[PDB]
Amino acid sequence: VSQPIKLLVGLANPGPEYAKTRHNAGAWVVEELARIHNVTLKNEPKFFGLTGRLLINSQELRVLIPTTFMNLSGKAIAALANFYQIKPEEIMVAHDELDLPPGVAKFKQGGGHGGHNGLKDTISKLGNNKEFYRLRLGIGHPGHKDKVAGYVLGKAPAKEQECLDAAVDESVRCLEILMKDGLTKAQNRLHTFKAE
């Protein structure tokens, strides 16, 4: 039974050249979960995004990858959330997280956007409501304010990308545990993980 998530959003910038930039880490999670569960994501221009529905341990989970600019991610999330009557507190938003290193991922309930343009827009489009969950996929931090945007929009080197892909995999396993055992159990597992 209880688990509050009805919608998982993986934040992204659109189109083939952005697919493997760090800023798309949330989208990697959603695509992998969707793949393992045999769901083909469908483009729905009415929701400014790619959508699907998975059944996991008899719970319906909607997924969404916006095709907006990252800074307009709330256009998508509010459109789909309004259509399905999903409250902010039932949404989990996967995203790249500067404040964790490659290879680590954490769940979080509420909090600020941290300068993340996607999170920022999401909050505003959901009525200045921060109380959605997050899946924070660590990307490291370049430790110079002026280098942040280029770092986030860049492509990790191969070795670092393996650490990233490992955290994606484990985040997917823990979303599955989320749906079966609940959040405390999912979180207890995810928060001890670090990739090699």
Task: Give DSSP secondary structure letters for 101-125.
Answer: -TT-EEEEES---TT-HHHHHHHHH
- The beta strand positions in the chain, using DSSP E, are 7-10, 42-44, 49-56, 59-66, 91-97, 105-109, 133-138
- CA dist 53 and 44 (Å) reads 13
* Residue 18 annotated in ligand binding: yes
- CA dist 94 and 196 (Å) reads 22
- Report the first-to-last Cα separation within the chain, whole angstroms: 34
Closest to 105 (Cα-Cα) out of 12, 10, 20, 37: 10
Domains and CATH numbers, the chain: 1-196 (3.40.50.1470)
Q: What 3-state DSSP class applies to 130?
A: coil
φ/ψ (deg, to 5) at 55: -110, 120
| DSSP code at position 6 | S
30-35: long-range contacts (C-beta < 8 A, 24 or more apart)? Answer: 30/63, 30/64, 30/65, 30/94, 31/65, 32/168, 32/169, 32/172, 33/8, 33/63, 33/172, 33/175, 33/176, 34/63
Residue 47 backbone zone (phi > 0: left; psi -120 to 50: alpha; other: beta): alpha
- CA dist 44 and 49 (Å) reads 6
φ/ψ (deg, to 5) at 99: -85, 5
Consecutive H or E run containing 32: helix 25-36
Summarize the chain as % helix, strand, coil (round to 5).
Answer: 45, 20, 35
* Residue 117 annotated in ligand binding: yes
* Residue 129 annotated in ligand binding: no
Catalytic, 141? Answer no
Token pair 């990308």: residue: 161
Residues 6+ apart with CB under 8 A from 40: 34, 52
